[PDB]
């Protein structure tokens, strides 16, 4: 029930083989898997908690220029030399100046000049890698127990953490079984290509090559005192005014510019425990060992009373809060979904098995009624409470929503999205392979282009495809244009 009302929940219903079903646990989303006779339970990825980060580069933003010194020489007497050049902290640039007899030099012409200034760095930026022997994903598993305090609770679940070295685990659900995890944590995100920079109590998951490309003075990052910065010329700016003299500036703090230059990065919570809260993970669920816990119970023989008025979730299912009244025992909850006057059983139970545990706590039965006018009966007797609820929408709307959700998933996961809720089908492997090849070509072609650039190129390709008289060219260009438009529309986030 932890995944009720989230708004990003996606159902998984099919099972195959040994009841193993794979699911891709996107961090924001939460998967609510269900089966024919297994306890329906919802899953989400809590945190991935990178730990023991090792730094490798400090790059500066705020410098400070001290001890500006200059030397000058007559024309045709060589470059100006200054003893401070052979020091790491000194940044020194040559230039040319003009001088005649007014400057004490007999020869008329252009003279050399140097200006060395010691550059000190204040408030550097650390960039830290993460090694895979110290990364701890965390998966929380919650069963649809029907508990009183479970409807939207964010703290009721069974934690089952996984590390890349210890891939598989077994989370023992209390009095339900053992949800075997054959998860694959290595393919989720490639932290080898991503290094984690932290500046001024903030963090971002930037690409490694992009970090290595940006123009700021870096250093070894060995945590020693007086580090020597490479490429100091990116902060100091020498300004020869009228070929008379030279001046030095420090150019100020690059913090705001750096914040702008992180426009596509994803922020994480380095503060406290370096807890990364962005990413995704794929796993498969071995439901062979689970048990229903409710098969041996008897039918509840007395009337119910609902506490909270029936409220409908964002995904079209119905959530009910009933409380047992008459009989004193833990019993199975009768349930049926008849129509207005036709007795057609069409409503499914999202909860695997509703059971009153104590009779003093209400139950949290959730159901998915068919769209239209359908009655709900939750009692064995004639005095059973009757709930009539009119659902909106049609199967066309559900199909459109499913198609949009699948397209948006494939626009993010990409290759991995083809085996989101896969049951191991032979055709699904073929589809995943084809999508993998095509996406590997597509991202190679389109890597590093803006969202607006993608839209422009896509509309241009669509125009080319429409105009061209070649069938192959027309079809390929139209397809690529449509794909590029739909991708560029949703790329930014």
């Amino acid at each position, epitope marked *: 029930m932890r995944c009720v009302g989230v708004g990003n929940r996606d159902f998984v219903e099919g099972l195959s083989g040994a009841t193993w079903v794979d699911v891709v646990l996107e961090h924001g989303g939460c998967v609510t898997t269900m089966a024919k006779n297994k306890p329906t339970l919802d899953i989400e990825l809590q945190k991935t908690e990178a730990t023991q980060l090792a730094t490798l580069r400090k790059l500066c933003i705020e410098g*400070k220029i001290t*001890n*500006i010194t200059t030397d000058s020489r007559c024309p045709t007497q060589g470059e100006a030399v200054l003893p401070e050049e052979q020091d790491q902290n000194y940044v020194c640039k040559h230039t040319y100046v003009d001088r005649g007899w007014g400057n004490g030099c007999g020869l008329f012409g252009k003279g050399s000049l140097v200006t060395c200034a010691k550059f*000190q*760095c*204040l*408030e550097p930026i650390e960039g830290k890698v993460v090694q895979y022997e110290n990364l701890k994903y965390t998966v929380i598993i919650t069963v649809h127990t029907g508990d009183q305090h479970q409807v939207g609770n964010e703290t009721q679940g069974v934690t089952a953490e996984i590390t890349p070295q210890a891939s598989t685990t077994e989370a023992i659900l209390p009095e339900y079984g053992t949800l075997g995890l054959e998860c694959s944590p290595r393919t989720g995100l490639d932290f080898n290509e991503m290094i984690l920079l932290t500046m001024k109590n903030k963090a971002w998951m930037v690409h490694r090559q992009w970090f290595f490309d940006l123009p700021l003075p870096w250093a070894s990052g060995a945590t020693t*005192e*007086t580090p020597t910065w490479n490429r100091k010329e990116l902060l100091v700016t020498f300004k020869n005014a009228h070929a008379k003299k030279q001046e030095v500036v420090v150019l100020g703090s690059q913090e705001g510019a750096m914040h702008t230059a992180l426009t596509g990065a994803t922020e994480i919570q380095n503060s406290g425990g370096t807890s990364i809260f962005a990413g995704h993970l794929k796993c498969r669920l071995k439901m062979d060992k689970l048990e229903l816990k409710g098969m041996s119970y008897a039918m509840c023989t007395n009337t119910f009373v609902l506490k909270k008025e029936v409220s409908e979730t964002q995904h079209g299912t119905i959530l009910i809060k009933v409380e047992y009244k008459g009989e004193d025992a833990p019993c199975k909850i009768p349930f049926s979904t008849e129509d207005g006057q036709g007795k057609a059983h069409n409503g499914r139970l999202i909860t695997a098995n509703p059971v009153v545990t104590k009779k003093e706590e209400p139950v949290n039965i959730e159901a998915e009624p068919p769209f239209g006018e359908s009655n709900i009966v939750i009692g064995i007797g004639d005095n059973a409470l009757k709930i009539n609820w009119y659902k909106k929408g049609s199967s066309i709307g559900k199909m459109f929503e499913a198609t949009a959700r699948g397209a948006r998933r494939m626009a993010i996961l990409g290759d991995t999205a083809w085996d989101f809720g896969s049951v191991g089908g032979v055709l699904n492997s073929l589809g995943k392979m084809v999508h993998q090849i095509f996406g590997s070509a597509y991202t190679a072609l389109f890597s590093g282009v803006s969202w607006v650039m993608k839209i422009g190129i896509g509309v241009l390709l669509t125009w080319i495809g429409l105009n061209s008289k070649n069938t192959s060219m027309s079809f390929s260009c139209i397809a690529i244009g449509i794909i590029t438009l739909y991708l560029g529309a949703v790329v930014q986030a």
Partner: antibody
Amino acid sequence: QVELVESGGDVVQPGKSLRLSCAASGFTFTNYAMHWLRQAPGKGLEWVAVISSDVNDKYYADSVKGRFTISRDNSKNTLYLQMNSLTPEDTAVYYCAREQAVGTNPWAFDYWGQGTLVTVSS
Amino acid sequence: HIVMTQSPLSLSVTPGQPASISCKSSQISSWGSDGKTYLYWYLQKPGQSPQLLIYEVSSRFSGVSDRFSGSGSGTDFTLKISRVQAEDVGLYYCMQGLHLPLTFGQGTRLEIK
């Protein structure tokens, strides 16, 4: 946004040594030269000692030279001042001044600590 | 050991009026290599900690009101306030940063007349 808070100030009899501590926050400490300054009551501001960015280099005011010791615990982000052979004259409100954020001088003051009071009397 | 002598020792001025403080050095505080002049002006407000108003002879520090401006070239420097408000009570300690044993001035006092 930077915060420099004093610590260690208390009463002390003449001749008894005292160790002052300047806790720092709001900036990277290891890159900043730090200073100690004092203001005797009703007297002009008088700079005491300076420690530069490198820990080894230190300097002291001649009026207090040879009586004090200045140390930097940059791992804990705090500054240490060791006062030895205190004199009843050496009673004042003591400050902790950061290096200048922008400028040319290797040593300057831009942000002053809240201030601590040390009293040397019998 | 450059000693800083300030011309005014007490400046009682009415609000909305100018004010001129002088801090005269015993030696030119003009560093030869860069040509800058390292003279600083602090203000310790009563019951407060000193601030930094002009971190050079005439380049004012950040967060300082619009009216505080300095001058002076070799030894005769000034601190000009355009319009005095009621918050200007304090002690305008000047300072020289040219030499390592830097010494403050005695510091003038400003009050509302």
